[PDB]
Design a protein around this nucleic acid. Sequence first.
DNA 1: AGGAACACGTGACC
DNA 2: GGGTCACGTGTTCC
Lengths: 75, 73
Amino acid sequence: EPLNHVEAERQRREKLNQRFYALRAVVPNVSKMDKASLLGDAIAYINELKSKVVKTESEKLQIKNQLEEVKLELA
Amino acid sequence: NHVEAERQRREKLNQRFYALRAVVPNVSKMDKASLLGDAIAYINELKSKVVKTESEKLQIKNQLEEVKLELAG
DNA sequence: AGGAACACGTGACC
DNA sequence: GGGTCACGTGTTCC
């Protein structure tokens, strides 16, 4: 019996399904319950988040300029 | 239908795994499972920075309004 | 030598 | 049904 190949395949399959559930717990608003749809919404969620990190760190630098401009106008 | 139908489902999935590698940094020759694990870790690092940066921004916006007030007096 | 990691066809469940 | 999941199998890489 080639059994240890059948069991090893069973653990891999289990580890991945464990990961899918953890993915479902952090990605907001998924409604088609299929696996392909899950990954699709995950990719979109990641793009949206890095896009926001870039806009916020930029807005912060920009407001740091106005503060510096007004200190200079002061005196 | 039925062999062909299964190839279409399998292909739809495999396309998406590869795209996942293209949006997360440093995950090139990894396992499918470790890939999903790091995607989760990266989503967590990403929200975390959004919160921290927005905190820093407010601290600076409060400071701006104070000097605006000193300027107009 | 055998563990790891992948894609495949087939049976079953809605 | 059409569409999805789980399973054992065949393969290749160290």
